[PDB]
Amino acid sequence: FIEKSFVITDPRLPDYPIIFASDGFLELTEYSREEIMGRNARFLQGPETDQATVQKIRDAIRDQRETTVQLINYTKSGKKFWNLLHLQPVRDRKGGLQYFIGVQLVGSD
Numbered sequence: 026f027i028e029k030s031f032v033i034t035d036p037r038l039p040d041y042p043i044i045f046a047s048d049g050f051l052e053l054t055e056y057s058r059e060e061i062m063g064r065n066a067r068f069l070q071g072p073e074t075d076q077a078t079v080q081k082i083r084d085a086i087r088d089q090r091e092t093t094v095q096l097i098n099y100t101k102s103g104k105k106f107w108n109l110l111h112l113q114p115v116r117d118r119k120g121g122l123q124y125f126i127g128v129q130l131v132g133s134d
């Protein structure tokens with residue numbers, strides 16, 4: 026889904042850096058690709074983000090399972106939005122986790 030907001034992260038590098046951010050992710054978050062690359066996606070969180078939901082994401086990553094959650098995130102300018110976030114593990118030919126894809130399916134409402 027090239028036309029959506031998504032990032033691809035590399036679990037095989039320290040702290041799951043973003044290695045690709047789609048045009049839609051730039052549009053949603055207001056950050057530049059240069060401001061995003063190599064970061065962990067948690068930079069989108071802020072004071073109003075529910076930690077119980079952050080824990081659910083941790084668990085999904087630990088267990089390498091697909092999941093969907095809703096949580097408050099923040100654009101570069103500090104604007105709050107509800108993010109319906111879908112996380113999808115991608116495995117290589119040998120069954121080993123290779124990427125995690127995160128789609129911000131809906132940004133607010």
Ligand SMILES: Cc1cc2nc3c(=O)[nH]c(=O)nc-3n(C[C@H](O)[C@H](O)[C@H](O)COP(=O)(O)O)c2cc1C
Pocket residue numbers: 032033034041065066067069070079080082083086096098108110112125126127128129
């Ligand atoms: C592919 C992928 C995409 C993610 N996208 C978001 C996102 O859009 N917003 C967000 O708040 N966290 C997102 N996260 C979650 C954080 O990167 C992080 O995994 C989460 O905050 C739990 O880890 P922590 O407790 O170490 O922060 C994403 C994670 C992955 C692997």
